[PDB]
RNA sequence: ACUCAACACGGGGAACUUUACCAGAUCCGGACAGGGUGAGGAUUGACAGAUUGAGUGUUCUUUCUCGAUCCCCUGAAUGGUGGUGCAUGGCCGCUUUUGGUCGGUGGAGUGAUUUGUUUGGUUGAUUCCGUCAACGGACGAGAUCCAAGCUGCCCAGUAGGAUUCA
RNA sequence: UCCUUGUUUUGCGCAAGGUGAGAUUUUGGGCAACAGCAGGUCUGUGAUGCUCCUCAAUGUUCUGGGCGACACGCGCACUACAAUGUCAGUGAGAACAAGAAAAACGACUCUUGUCGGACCUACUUGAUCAAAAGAGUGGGAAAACCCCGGAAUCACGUAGACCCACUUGGGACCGAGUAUUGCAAUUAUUGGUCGCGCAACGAGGAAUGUCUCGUAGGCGCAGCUCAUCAAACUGUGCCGAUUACGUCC
């Protein structure tokens, strides 16, 4: 391995200030940042029936979630990445998956 | 992943539900649930507080062990929290509530739904609807709706300034429905779907 | 032993779609799901959301 | 759907339903006791206990015609 | 069907038991800390009873149960297990 | 469920389950004890043989094994894909994909009413323009939203190229 | 927007051309007022009023056996496959598609509070002799594995067979053998090879369905349901036209 940070969401506008702010500290505050990207966004798709009996004219509802992904870099911090890490905690529904 | 979005959506639902019917009476709205890593982190979100948390804590603590036997927390992973959300006239759910509990107790249709709709208008709410079906008069049902202001009903712009709340009534010789709409002066944050300005 | 043995037995084996019952409520007819493994359409869909689902086309 | 009301063909000698069968006084039946002698009491016991550890306690055996039997362990040692 | 005892032993120091609405067994915290395990059924059967006494405060919500147990509740449970208490609360804050 | 808005529809492609329906056997999931049960109590489970579709203690014979809530009797409670969709909520379909709906102030009439919302042109659109006793609003239309085509900034050790040397 | 200074009233706009990735609701969706129907649903729900039933039950019954949308002269609805020589049919060789799908179930071994396996698929073997099957090893929690996703329609200067016939066109029915799925495949469950084809059917009456451009039509794949089985439904891609762009009969 080397030290990647993935982060996943249910929406945009909370990918953003996590990565695109608030990974400061790894930036050009301190250290080196290799800075790849987002991925392809996935879609979550339920085709469901719009009628709770049999009858109608055969009509249905499509319903969707969006995921979104991203992912960075770092070469090698020796516990810098405790500090980096830590200070965005922020949006509910927004997970960290470090490696 | 695909799952845990979905792990926390089902969380969500079951955790809304549960708070919503056995809390009642408090103008219950909404929560919000989030984590820090290692904690949970689930506040609370209802008209009145002293309801909420209880004498001198019993409720609030009673809530947490609840929640912490189904979803197999360990005491300190779990945390509550109640605030006010004060203006209760620009809550569907908060008038959703209140109007019910009169029906319940025999007060009349027209007189319960105007009484409403004065509460709302004065907090400063855009417009205001009520409905209610079910009974009334006897046989056949009847449905009828009081209207004050003036408001959107189409777009996705009718989703970001009208949250609205469906309830029940039970009585004898019927069910009763009810319902509350209520159109904010305000977005989720800002924005306004048509009305262009201009600015000297 | 006896009786007890005899009852409730062949679908604690778990097999067909017997022994589904939605999370939601408990019922069983007008499928479980297993698509992307949640459960709702026996309480309605069209009812509950609160999952992050929204219908945009 | 639908529905009705009637069940019977019936008018059989149906099922008795069943009740305990009572022993009364069932230790002193079991642990037997003597005439005195050197002012020591003397206990035998008619019923030998089973060896396993469920019934490693008090817990006796049982005595039928053909076989013997253990009511916990639910074991035969055949006579 | 004694496991009565244990049962009671979890409800005090909680105020607060929780099960699934099954008819196969399971143990009604899912953890306890003392590792006890009932079946569903025989806990189910236990609150029903005291419930029709006042003792209990009943909230279903899906497909499970959440038990609340009254000041009403203490009173009964005190006298069973020959025990006095403080406060099922104030040990707890 | 029966014209269009029944008839590859009830997510209904069911071996058992699912399942309502038929033949047969089983279990209390009858809470709450006011009314009855000595140390045995009232009570639970069962090998073997027999009954039986059943090496199913269902039941009997036999004996052993166990909480005394379990057990016995009335009241009551409960569960139900039982009835009623012409008791009812919610949701959906359809009327109706058509451009429609309503009030305020002003004007005209003693008023039932009308003007606004009209003859004309124009547009998918009560969409606009012209004439004009009307003016200014609110819903529907439009707009806001989602996807597709082109493009900027961003990006690669999970995308893929270029050159060199063997 | 621009221009034709055409057309129109200077107006609202309209037609043709130009500009451009795109030219007129840019293209396809979702949303959608007021007033209603005695439309459907009590077989979606701890959504329910009043009634019915309650210990030899209409409850529970995941209990054993049967029945279910399945049982057979016959009418009707929707689907799929054909009557072949415009790929047309059995054989061969070449190129070639994108949305999407998979992970956890108290047993196990790990220490002191947690690893692995129940899901896909590759390679190799089996194969010193059919398919179907069998077995061992490895990867992937998904833009990493499968995957350079070698789809089918299609193409051929492949000197390929076939020849107008109900024929090698179509198969429906029908017998035998075998393996897998499952606790249980008997009223054949599903594959997979032999025989049955000499069973229909040779472009289809009255009448009738919905469509205007990447559309109609042809063709294939995945998801859905889910031990097993899709001529269905939902979604994505490939090959890709004719006619009209009008009227009120």
């Known amino acids: 391995q080397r030290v990647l940070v993935k982060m996943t969401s249910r929406n945009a506008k909370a990918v953003e200030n996590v990565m695109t702010e608030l990974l400061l500290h790894a930036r050009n505050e301190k250290v080196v940042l290799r800075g790849p990207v987002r991925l392809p966004t996935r879609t979550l798709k339920v085709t469901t029936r719009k009628t709770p009996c049999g009858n109608g004219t055969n009509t249905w509802d499509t319903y969707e979630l969006k995921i979104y992904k991203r992912l960075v870099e770092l070469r090698a911090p020796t516990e810098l990445v405790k500090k980096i890490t830590s200070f965005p905690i922020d949006a509910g529904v927004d997970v960290a998956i470090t490696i | 992943k695909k799952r845990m979005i979905i792990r926390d959506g089902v969380f969500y639902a079951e955790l809304f539900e549960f708070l919503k019917r056995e809390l009642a009476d408090d103008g219950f709205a909404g929560v919000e649930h989030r984590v820090t890593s290692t904690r949970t982190e689930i506040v609370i979100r209802a008209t009145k507080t002293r309801e909420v948390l209880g004498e001198k804590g019993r409720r609030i603590r009673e809530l947490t062990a609840c929640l912490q036997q189904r979803f197999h927390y360990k005491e300190g992973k779990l945390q509550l929290f109640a605030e006010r959300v004060e203006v209760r006239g620009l809550s569907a759910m908060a008038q959703a509530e209140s109007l019910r509990f009169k029906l319940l107790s025999n007060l009349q249709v027209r007189r319960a739904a105007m009484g409403i709709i004065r509460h709302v208008m004065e907090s400063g709410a855009k417009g205001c609807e009520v409905t209610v079906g079910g009974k009334i008069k006897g046989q056949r049902a009847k449905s009828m709706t009081f209207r004050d202001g003036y408001m959107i009903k189409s777009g996705t712009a009718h989703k970001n300034f009208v949250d609205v709340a469906t309830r029940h009534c039970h009585l004898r010789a019927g069910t009763l429905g009810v319902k509350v709409k209520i159109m904010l002066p305000k977005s989720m944050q800002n924005e306004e779907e048509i009305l262009p300005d201009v600015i000297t | ?57 | 759907k639908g529905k009705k009301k009637k069940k019977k063909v019936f008018t059989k000698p149906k099922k008795p339903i069943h009740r305990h069968k009572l022993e009364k006084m069932r230790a002193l039946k079991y642990f037997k006791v003597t005439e005195n002698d050197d002012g020591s009491f003397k206990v035998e016991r008619t019923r030998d206990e089973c060896p396993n550890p469920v019934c490693g306690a008090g817990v006796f055996m049982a005595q039928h015609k053909d076989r013997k039997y253990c009511g916990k362990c639910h074991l035969t040692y055949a006579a | 069907k004694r496991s009565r005892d244990d049962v009671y032993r979890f409800f005090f120091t909680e105020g607060v038991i929780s099960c699934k609405k099954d008819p196969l067994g399971t143990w009604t915290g899912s953890l306890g800390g003392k590792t006890f395990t009932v079946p569903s059924i025989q806990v189910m059967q236990l609150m029903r009873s005291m419930k029709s006494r006042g003792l209990i405060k009943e909230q279903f919500a899906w497909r499970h149960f959440y038990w609340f147990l009254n000041d009403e509740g203490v009173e009964y449970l005190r006298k069973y297990l020959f025990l006095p208490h403080d406060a099922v609360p104030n040990t707890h804050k």
């Open chain 3, 1 to 57: 032993m006896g009786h007890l043995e005899q009852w409730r037995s062949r679908q604690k084996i778990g097999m067909g779609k017997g022994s589904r019952h939605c999370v939601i409520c408990s019922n069983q007819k007008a499928v479980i799901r297993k698509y992307e493994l949640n459960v709702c359409r026996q309480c309605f869909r069209e009812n509950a959301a609160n999952i992050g689902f929204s219908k945009l086309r």
